[PDB]
Amino acid sequence: VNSFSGYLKLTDNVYIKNADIVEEAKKVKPTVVVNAANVYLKHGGGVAGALNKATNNAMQVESDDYIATNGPLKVGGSCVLSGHNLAKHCLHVVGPNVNKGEDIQLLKSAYENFNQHEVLLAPLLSAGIFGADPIHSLRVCVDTVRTNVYLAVFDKNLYDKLVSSFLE
């Protein structure tokens, strides 16, 4: 478990790799995989759709029963549920969707959830169709997370831009 390999070390606790988070979860067998969730835990699109399909929809069935009784999460909040075949636990984290006018300042609160876990496999929060500046998201991660975080970014041009920008 937690067999991470091939990552660039950005800081003493933040690592990054150009990889699909689903393929990393299958290789690594992490204690925790982070999902780039939304408040009603509808696992479509982006990371969430890929993670749920890799569980053959088990993640969606569990998430629907959670939401039915507990209601939606808040932006910046999180929820631990089963990791199914991908991890021991899945930490569902809601970053702000700035393309839908949500508050970018809540991105810090979204990464603060990672500090409850010693080591995590995670995506870059609020990137992709959520619209945040990826360079900004990586800075908020580095400044906020104190535990060991292994970021999987599934886009070579974005990965190459993030690393170049970070190394300036």
Query: Torsion over CA of 30, 14, 74 and 55, rounded to 10 degrees?
Result: -20
> By CB under 6 A, is residue 141 in contact with ligand A1AL7?
no
Only segment of 1-9, 19-27, 71-79, 82-90 that touches ligand A1AL7 (CB under 6 A) = 19-27
What DSSP string describes 49-109? HHHHHHTTTHHHHHHHHHHHHH----TT-EEEEE-TTT-SEEEEE----GGGT--GGGHHH
Strand, coil or helix: 18: strand
Residue 22 Cβ, how far from ligand A1AL7 at the closest point, in Å? 6
Contact flags string 98-137 toward ligand A1AL7, x per CB under 6 A: -------------------------xx--xxxx-------
Token reading at 135: 């360079």
Out of 58, 155, 161, 166, the residue judged to bind ligand A1AL7 by CB under 6 A? 155
**Is residue 132 a contact partner of residue 107, using CB atoms and an 8 Å limit?**
yes
Near ligand A1AL7 by CB under 6 A: residue from 10, 14, 16, 22: 22
Contacts to ligand A1AL7 by CB under 6 A: 20-22, 36, 46-47, 50, 123-124, 127-130, 152-155, 158
